[PDB]
Assembly symmetry: C3
Homo-oligomer: 224 residues x 3
Amino acid sequence: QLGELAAAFASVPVFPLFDAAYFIVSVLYLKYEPGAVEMSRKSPFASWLCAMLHCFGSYILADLLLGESPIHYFSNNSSVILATAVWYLIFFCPMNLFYKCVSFLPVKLIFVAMKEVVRVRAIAAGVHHAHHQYHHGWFIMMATGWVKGSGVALMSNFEQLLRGVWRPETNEILHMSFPTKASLYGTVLFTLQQTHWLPVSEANLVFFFTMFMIVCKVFMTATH
Amino acid sequence: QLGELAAAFASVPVFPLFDAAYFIVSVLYLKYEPGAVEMSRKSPFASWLCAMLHCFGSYILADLLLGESPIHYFSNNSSVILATAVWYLIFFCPMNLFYKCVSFLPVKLIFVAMKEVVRVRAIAAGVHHAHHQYHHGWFIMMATGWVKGSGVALMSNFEQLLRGVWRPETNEILHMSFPTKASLYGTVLFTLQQTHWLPVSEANLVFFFTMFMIVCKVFMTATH
Amino acid sequence: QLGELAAAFASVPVFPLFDAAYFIVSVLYLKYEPGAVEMSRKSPFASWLCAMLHCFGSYILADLLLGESPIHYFSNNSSVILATAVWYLIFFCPMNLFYKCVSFLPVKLIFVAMKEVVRVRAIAAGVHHAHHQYHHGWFIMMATGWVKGSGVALMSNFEQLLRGVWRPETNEILHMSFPTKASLYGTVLFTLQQTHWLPVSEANLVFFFTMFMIVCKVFMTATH
Ligand SMILES: [Ca+2]
Ligand SMILES: [Cl-]
Ligand SMILES: [Cl-]
Ligand SMILES: [Cl-]
Ligand SMILES: [Cl-]
Ligand SMILES: [Cl-]
Ligand SMILES: [Cl-]
Ligand SMILES: [Cl-]
Ligand SMILES: [Cl-]
Ligand SMILES: [Cl-]
Ligand SMILES: [Cl-]
Ligand SMILES: [Cl-]
Ligand SMILES: [Cl-]
Ligand SMILES: [Cl-]
Ligand SMILES: [Cl-]
Ligand SMILES: [Cl-]
C-alpha cells in the first residue's frame, strides 16, 4: 500500500501552508544577506522586489527558458499577497516577533522540510511542463526542472545587482551549492521517469526524493 | 463639457509630432551622458543603438515582461526612421544647429511637455495591454504600466554597459528618480481605474495625470 | 549554369558534417580563452554550458529577439549530443589527440571554411524567419540575421560572466570584430534580397557571400 501513501504524499495542496513555509525560509535567507535590513528601511520597494525574486525566482527562470512571460506567475494574486505578507512580517513586525517565532529551531526545521516538498514538486512540474511543449526535448526538460528547483540561486549575480552588489568572480553554475546540485540530480531523475526509462512511478519518485531532500536540508539546517 | 475636452486630449495622435518630442528629449539626455559625443564618433552603430534604447526602452521592457518580442515595436518602420533622424540631427547636424534649436529653453519646455503626453498614454496602454492578457492580473498590469512610463531608466545599468560603463552600486529601483517614482504612482492609478475601484473615467485620469506630469517636468526643466 | 551550381551549394546538408566543423572551431576558440582548461577540470558542467553558448549562441540570441524560447534549438538532441562530443573530445581526449588533429593547419582551415558555410546560411535563415513573422519588419530582419551570424560574440560579456570574468570596458557592439561586422553587412544584403530591391537570387547571394567569408576567414586563420 506504499503507492497509496505515495499518491497522497505527491498530491498534497502546496497552497497555502506549504508555499508559506517556502516563502518564510526564502525571505529569512534574504534577511541574512548583508545590508538587507538597511535596504528594507531605505529602499522598501527594492526590498519587496528582492523577496519576490526569492519566493518566485523558480517560476521566473522557467518562464524565461520556455519563452513565456517571466512574471506570468504573478497573476496568482493570493500567492503574491501571501509572499508580500511574509516579507512584511519578517522585516517590519513589531518587536521582530514574527522573525523570533519562525527562527525558533523546532519551527524552522519544519518550514525547511515543508519547503523541500514544494521544491521537489516544482522540479517535477518543470519537467512535465517542458515535456508538454517538447515530447522529446530531454535537454529542455532537464533545464526547466533544474531552474524550478534551484530558484533564485541561479540568478544570484543579478539578485545582488538589484541590491547594489556585484561579485562576478563566482556564480551558482561555476560553483554549485547543495540545493542547486541536488536539483540537477532531481531533474535528471524526473526526466528519466518521463522517458519511461526509469522504471518507477512518478509518485514514488516524488516521495523518495522529497524525503532525501528533507533529511539533507533538516540535517544541514540543524547542524548550523 | 470637461469630459468632452478630456476625450479629445486623451485621443490626440502621438505620431509623429508627440513621438518626435519624445525622441528629441530622450536623445538630448543621451548626449548629456559622459562620453556620448566621443562614442558617436568612434562607435556610431553603438551610439545609434543607445538612442533606440532611450527612444523605445519602454516598449522593449514591456514586451520582455509580457513574454513578447523585445524588438516587436521596431516593426514600425516610420517610428524607427524618425528616431534615427533625431539621433543623426542631434549628433551630426552641421554647425550643431539642430541641437541649438531644440535646446532653446522655450522650445525645450514644449518638447518636455509633449513627452509627458506620450508617457502617460504609454502607462495607460501598458495597463490595458496587460489586462487584455490577464483580466485579474493586477501585479502584471502595474509592472507593465510601470516600465512603459519609466522606459530606459529601469535598464540604465545595461545602457551603461553598452557604452562601456559599469556602476553597479546603484540602480533606478534601489534609488528611484522622479519619472520612475511618478510612473509607479501612475500605473497604480490606471490599474485602479481598470479594476473599476477608482470611480473616474479613463480620459479624465489621462488628462489630470498628464497635466501633473507636465507641470512637474516643465518646472524641473526650467529650474535647472 | 552558375545558378544550377549555386542552388546545389546553398542547399548542402549542414548536419552533421558542416555543423561539426562549426562546433570544432567554436570549442577550439573556447579552449584558447584564459582559464578554460582549468575550468573544464574544476567546473565541468559550467565548461559544457560555455561550449553550448559557443555552439548555439546564434540560435539563443535569435530566439530571444523574436520572443521565442532561448533554448528552443536544444530540442534537437542530435545536434546537442554532437556538440557535447566535440566539447568532450577537445578537452578530455587521451593524449589530447583530438585537439592535435583538428588544430593541424590544413585540417583547421577546412573546418574554418565549412563554418562560414553554416554562418552565411544562418544569417539568411534569420532574415527569412523574421520576415515570416513580420513581412515588412526590415529592422527585425536585420537584427535577427545579425545575431544568427555573430553568435556568441554578441554575448561575450555574459559568456565571460559565466566563467567568472567581468570586463565591461568593451563589448562586441562598441568595438566590432570582423565576423560581427561582416554579419552586419550580410544581414543587410540578405534583407535587401528579401525586399526584392537587390536584384539577385538568394542562392547566388549565399554562394558569393560564403566565398567572401571563406576567403577572408581562411586568410585570417592561416596568417595567425
Ligand atoms: Ca514568448
Ligand atoms: Cl551578497
Ligand atoms: Cl522605495
Ligand atoms: Cl510548479
Ligand atoms: Cl513549470
Ligand atoms: Cl512531437
Ligand atoms: Cl553614466
Ligand atoms: Cl560602428
Ligand atoms: Cl503605447
Ligand atoms: Cl504595452
Ligand atoms: Cl480569466
Ligand atoms: Cl576573457
Ligand atoms: Cl560541475
Ligand atoms: Cl539556421
Ligand atoms: Cl532563425
Ligand atoms: Cl502584414
